[PDB]
Every structure is written in structure tokens, then in C-alpha cells.
Design a protein around this ligand. Structure first.
Ligand SMILES: [Mg+2]
Ligand SMILES: [Mg+2]
Ligand SMILES: [Mg+2]
Ligand code: NA
Lengths: 152, 152
DNA sequence: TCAAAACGTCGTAC
DNA sequence: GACGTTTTGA
DNA sequence: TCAAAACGTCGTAC
DNA sequence: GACGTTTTGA
């Protein structure tokens, strides 16, 4: 796992606290044992005319990709291992999004265990609730309650 | 002149590039010799529920203030001397807003001479045009062209 | 006559 | 910014 | 059954 | 985020 430079992390942390997102999702999906996917995403959003900025992020992070949705574009990192490595290093410098970052870390490390028991899986969905609670969440639909209602 | 930590400036630069604004305005105002005020503003916006972040900033920058504006709040720095001192030190770390930062500095250093001649005043106004051209400017009204007419 | 503050509005870029 | 639904390709 | 990508919309918080 | 109009107080 690559070691990121501190100056880079410091600036990136600031910019993430401003225009980034640390996202956790429970995605209803019939092909999973517990009928839901656990989905983590690190994202940085910027007007497409400045997507060169996001393209640099890819070079500097060395992983992830940029997707253009129209007037706006996103840097995206969803790969679990690279995500853990990156957040572990960024986390210390976050001020607005530190708890979310850490909750993500906690979730990733427990995934293996969440696969085993419906209970441990339900607990983990709770951590996702905390992430969403900390964020400026407005259009969320699938929660730990949703999972509890399905595991029956 | 108060001298800021690099760790501080690096994180703040990222956050500014994200959620900050470097604003230059020509404010129509009859009480001025050229019938407009030159206004410089450094601004950071954030949901009012995260005020404390902005309030911390005031302590850390040691100058400026926070204004709650309903559901959103703002850190503001308008005083010219601290603004020059702060921007001079922040500028090396901005990626998105570095050019307007340098333009603000130039304007500040020229203000005195700009008050002497309408021609120099006009030129300075063209630099504020440049700052607005760099920003995601959408509702601008007063430009150097409008100053130009008035001085006629 | 000026620097600075007070207060308000708009259209996205998050 | 922070979600959503559905598809891919193991 | 899964990790990850593809693709889309909502409601502000810039 | 990035403007706008109007007021304060030396
Ligand atoms: Mg923000
Ligand atoms: Mg931004
Ligand atoms: Mg923003
Ligand atoms: Na904006």
C-alpha cells in the first residue's frame, strides 16, 4: 500500500471537507445472501469544466477514476482495499468528515464477520446509519430498519 | 504581521478551493469620487449548523468575523491590510482560486494610485473583471465597462 | 471621501 | 454532496 | 454471492 | 459560491 505525502493529504483533507463525500450505502439487491449490498464510496465533486483537477487526483492517488455526469464530474474510489489504505492516511487531517471516514474504516475491517451472521450484519448497517446521520442526508431510503424487516 | 503555519494554510487552501470565495466588486456608490467603491472580500460559507468551524477560523486567522445568514453562515475578511497579509500567505497553496488571489493582491497594492487617476482606477476595475471571469460568476452587474461610461 | 459592515438575492455546483 | 436502481463480471 | 461499475436524481449548501 | 444595494462612522 502506497504512502501519500503529508502536504498532499493536508490540502486534500481541506478540499474533501468542503466539496467531497464519504458515503455508505445499503443497496437492495436480490443476489446477495442478505438481499442487500454494503457499498462504500469516496467521492470528490467538481464542475466538469474543472475536471482536470479531478484527473490529477487520479494520478496522485494512483487509483480511482473520474466520471462526467454532465455539468458536473466526480472523482470516485470504491475499491475496498485501496479505500482503506487511503482513508487511513487522510482520516487524521479531516475535520468535518473524520467520523465518517473512521466509520468506513471500521466497516471495512468487519465485513468478513458481517458475512457470517445476520446480527453482525445488522450491527454494521447501524454504522452506516451513523455515517448518513453525520452527512447532510436528504434522500435516503434504505436503512438498518429496512434490513431488519427483510432478515425475517 | 501575523505569520501562519503551513499545516494550517495547506488544509485551509484546500477548503477554500472547495467552499471559499475570493470576490472583487465595483459597488455603485454616489459618495465616492468615482461613484463606485472597490470592494474586496475573502469568504468561506458553511451550513449554519457547522458555524463552529467558521468561528474556529476567526480565532485561527485572528481577524475577520462570522455572519449567520439564516440556514447558511459566512466567515468574512474585508479589512484590506489583514487581507493582503493573509492572502499573500495562502496564495502559494491554492490550486483553483490562486489567480484571483494574486489579482486581489495586485489591486490592494494599486488602490492608492488608483484613487489618484480615473484612468488608473479604470484599469484596476479591469482586474476585478478578471477575477469575476475566473469565478463561477452568474449575477454580476457592475463592471469596468459600466464604470467607464459613468466617468464619461 | 473613504474602509468596512450590514443586509439581501440568485443559480448552480455540489 | 448524498443518495437511488440496476448491471457487470467474476 | 459478491466487489465494483454504470447510470441516474434529489435538495440544498454553497 | 458570487454577487447585489444600502448604511455606518471617521
Ligand atoms: Mg461544502
Ligand atoms: Mg466548490
Ligand atoms: Mg461546495
Ligand atoms: Na456554488
Amino acid at each position: 500500500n502506497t504512502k501519500y505525502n503529508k502536504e498532499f493529504l493536508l490540502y486534500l483533507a481541506g478540499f474533501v471537507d468542503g466539496d467531497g463525500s464519504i458515503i455508505a450505502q445499503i443497496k437492495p439487491n436480490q443476489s446477495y445472501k442478505f438481499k442487500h449490498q454494503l457499498s462504500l464510496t469516496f467521492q470528490v465533486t467538481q464542475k466538469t469544466q474543472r475536471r482536470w483537477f479531478l484527473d490529477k487526483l487520479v494520478d496522485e492517488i494512483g487509483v480511482g477514476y473520474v466520471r462526467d455526469r454532465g455539468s458536473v464530474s466526480n472523482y470516485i474510489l470504491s475499491e475496498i482495499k485501496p479505500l482503506h489504505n487511503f482513508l487511513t492516511q487522510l482520516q487524521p487531517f479531516l475535520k468535518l468528515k473524520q467520523k465518517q471516514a473512521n466509520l468506513v474504516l471500521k466497516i471495512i475491517e468487519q465485513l468478513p464477520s458481517a458475512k457470517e451472521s445476520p446480527d453482525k450484519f445488522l450491527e454494521v448497517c447501524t454504522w452506516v446509519d451513523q455515517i448518513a446521520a453525520l452527512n447532510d442526508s436528504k434522500t435516503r431510503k434504505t436503512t438498518s430498519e429496512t434490513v431488519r424487516a427483510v432478515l425475517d
